[PDB]
């Protein structure tokens, strides 16, 4: 039932804050934590993401983490900043300098035990905790290094709860530093072992969507984070809203993950919106969603095959029509859905639409095409590693270059394991 949410690092906290702003609006909770809605479907499964404090106040089950104080200081003064439990802000002062080793081994080690203190308090106040969700990026230091360090500690203490992450993949198109392939390659190693399901959010796909389709010539991180919080809202809808299908994290993982290491999902949303009035139809809503230009991992689905797909439609629409169109997309391109997992596309409907949209569709796909994403990261990694470039930042923190070779090998194996199922 209950989910504990963790957001680590600058990117983790900026997409996490936007996530809570969006779903608090959907569930009718104002920045003070007071409910002010008109429907009661909102409050039926509110406990999944909110604790009810005394006085009919709903407080997110969220823990905010960073090695640098600045980003969370902006959260606390942001729109919904006062809605978070003040004790659940955990932060150091040193920063991680975009260094995975600092977040995972040195500065992050100094702070991880107090984060787990707060994780315990929130878990103990759970009727029947189902798992955790972590928002972070893979290309910096705190969210990727200390983030993955948090995952393995959490798994040690709760070995039988579901571990779920929204992971932002770095891209040179939207790059803060040159060491991002190093931090990503080291993180994917951790994620491939200690998470049950990871939503791959590629910053390159977000940038192309903001520019090629949304037509924004100069996108800001706010523009990208508009798409992420929209995506995050869609995938969690079945978890936090009453419907014919009441979903949980474990049934999601059991049905989406045919093999333990292949748990990296590419999400998709339609209609892609930029910060309209012409509502879509179920036909065009389905075609956009499955199109590449609507997907958040910068991969071509036609270059791989879908192992499993889970899809959800928001709004007042005919379920018979949603079935025809989903069955139509399958039966017309059945080449791209594997034949050894029968009925691998599932579809849900929730009549409560997202804010500003009459109808919307969200898409969770376990596709072999995701191997393109790890191929991209491994190539950028190798280009520098073959010359040992920028490595001193990491050996200065006690890492040996053998750990780099191991992380690169494990990712290449991952790419290879996706390749074999693309042919069978």
């Amino acid at each position: 039932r209950e989910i504990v949410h963790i957001q680590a690092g600058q990117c983790g906290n900026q997409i996490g804050a936007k996530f809570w702003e969006v779903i608090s609006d959907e569930h009718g909770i104002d920045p003070t934590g007071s409910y002010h809605g008109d429907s009661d479907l909102q409050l039926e499964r509110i406990n999944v993401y909110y604790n009810e404090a005394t006085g009919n106040k709903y407080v997110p089950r969220a823990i905010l983490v960073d090695l640098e104080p600045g980003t969370m200081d902006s959260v606390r003064s942001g729109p919904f900043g006062q809605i978070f439990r003040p004790d659940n802000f955990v932060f150091g002062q040193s920063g991680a300098g975009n260094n995975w080793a600092k977040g995972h081994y040195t500065e992050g080690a100094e702070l991880v035990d107090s984060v787990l203190d707060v994780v315990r308090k929130e878990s103990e106040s759970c009727d029947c905790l189902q798992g955790f969700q972590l928002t972070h990026s893979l290309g910096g230091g705190t969210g990727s290094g200390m983030g993955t360090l948090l995952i393995s500690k959490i798994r040690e203490e709760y070995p039988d709860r579901i571990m779920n992450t929204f992971s932002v993949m770095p891209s040179p198109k939207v790059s803060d530093t040159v060491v991002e392939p190093y931090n990503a390659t080291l993180s994917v190693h951790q994620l491939v072992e200690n998470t049950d399901e990871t939503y791959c959010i590629d910053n390159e796909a977000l940038y192309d969507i903001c520019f090629r389709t949304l037509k924004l010539t100069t996108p800001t991180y706010g523009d990208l984070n508009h798409l992420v919080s929209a995506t995050m809202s869609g995938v969690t809808t079945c978890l936090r809203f009453p419907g014919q299908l009441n979903a949980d994290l474990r049934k999601l993982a059991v049905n989406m993950v045919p093999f333990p290491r292949l748990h990296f999902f590419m999400p998709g949303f339609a209609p892609l919106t930029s910060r309209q009035y012409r509502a879509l139809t179920v036909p065009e809503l389905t075609q956009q969603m499955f199109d590449s230009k609507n997907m958040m991992a910068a991969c071509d689905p036609r270059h791989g095959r879908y192992l499993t797909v889970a899809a959800i439609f928001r709004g007042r629409m005919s379920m018979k029509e949603v079935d025809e169109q989903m069955l139509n997309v399958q039966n017309k391109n059945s080449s791209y859905f594997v034949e050894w997992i029968p009925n691998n596309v599932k579809t849900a409907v929730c009549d409560i639409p997202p804010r500003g949209l009459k109808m919307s569709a969200t898409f969770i796909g376990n596709s072999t095409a995701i191997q393109e994403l790890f191929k991209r990261i491994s190539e950028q990694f190798t280009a520098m590693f073959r010359r040992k470039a920028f490595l001193h930042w990491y050996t200065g923190e006690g890492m040996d270059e053998m750990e780099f070779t191991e992380a690169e090998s494990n990712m290449n194996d991952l790419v290879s394991e996706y390749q074999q199922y693309q042919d069978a």
Partner: protein, 346 residues
């Protein structure tokens, strides 16, 4: 855009129909084991009917009738005719037949009871032994019966048409093959083009042992026969020339002397098993192409020898029949964005 699947690569008929579907742009062929198909050109043996009609959002159609084998295998056909009241123990158009199991119920006691009587009656008593090659004609029951004890398959022996219609020049036998399409509404469509399989050898009543004068099969004439292709190309005579010969020699027409009986025999057989194989209220739909084999005796009376379930067309006719299968059987269920068939109806 429809989706179909092919599961018998050998059939020349349904290989050509697949090309035509693809040649409309609106049909794409899927892999063999992809279950999300509109149409299946399934295999001849052990076709999985139990898996059709369960895919959500798909109207599924297969090119075979489940249960049609009762008509298309020899022993079953004999038991189907003799035991169905809708065909009587004796229908005037099927030779007296008896199904008999080898050494390893059986009618061999019944056959000899009839065979002996005919021997005592002095009536000509030549019988033919067959199974679903290994073909034996003889005038004594014991010669045929020992012949089938070697075989491990259940055999059937029926009366031999000692007096056949013999085409002149040549004093030669023939068999007429008709192609019949039964669509999902169980309409029966006779193709207006048939074929005559001609023996290139004069008919001899003394030695039923030499094969060529008695067997009109194309392979039995292509290889084991002496002057294949002498009178007509490939020992195949078509209806237009057969009609001309009947007009010239017998002063009749193919339609009256033969084709009315052929239409009656096809209708009787297919209406007989209709309640057992019809897909009228089924969760999937079936059609099927049939090959009926007919014999014509000296009185211009038509006899049914065999019904074939996986038949092959004549090369010249292939284009016209395979196209007609699409329009009548396939596009009646899956439309795209004069008639070559005679409809047989009650």
């Amino acid at each position: 855009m429809y989706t179909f699947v092919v599961r018998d690569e050998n059939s020349s008929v349904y290989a050509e129909v697949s090309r035509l579907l693809l040649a409309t742009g609106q049909w794409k062929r899927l892999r063999k084991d992809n279950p999300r198909f509109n149409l299946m050109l399934g295999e001849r043996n052990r076709l999985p009917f139990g898996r059709l009609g369960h895919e959500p959002g798909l109207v599924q159609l297969v090119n075979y009738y489940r249960g049609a084998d009762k008509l298309c295998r020899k022993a079953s056909l004999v038991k189907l005719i003799k035991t169905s009241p809708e065909l009587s123990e004796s229908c005037t158009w099927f030779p007296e037949s008896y199904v008999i199991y080898p050494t390893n119920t059986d009618e061999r006691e019944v056959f000899l009871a009839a065979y002996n009587r005919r021997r005592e009656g002095r009536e000509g008593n030549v019988w033919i032994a067959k199974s679903s090659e290994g073909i034996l004609i003889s005038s004594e029951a014991s010669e045929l019966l020992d012949f089938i004890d070697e075989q491990g398959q259940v055999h059937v022996i029926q009366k031999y048409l000692e007096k056949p219609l013999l085409l002149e020049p040549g004093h030669r036998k023939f068999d007429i093959r008709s192609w019949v399409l039964v669509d999902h509404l169980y309409n029966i469509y006779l193709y207006r083009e048939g074929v005559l399989r001609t023996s290139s050898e004069p008919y001899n009543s003394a030695n039923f042992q030499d094969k060529t004068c008695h067997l009109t099969n194309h392979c039995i004439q292509k290889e084991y026969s002496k002057n294949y292709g002498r009178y007509e190309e490939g020992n195949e005579m078509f209806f237009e020339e057969f009609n001309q010969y009947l007009m010239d020699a017998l002063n009749t027409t193919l339609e009256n002397s033969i084709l009315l009986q052929i239409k009656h025999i096809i209708r009787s057989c297919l209406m007989c098993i209709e309640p057992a194989i019809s897909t009228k209220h089924l969760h999937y739909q079936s059609f099927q192409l049939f090959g009926f084999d007919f014999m014509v005796d000296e009185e211009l009376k038509v006899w049914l020898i065999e019904v074939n379930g996986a038949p092959a067309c004549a090369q010249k006719l292939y284009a016209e029949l395979c196209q007609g299968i699409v329009d009548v059987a396939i596009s009646s269920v899956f439309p795209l964005a004069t008639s070559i068939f005679i409809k047989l109806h009650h």
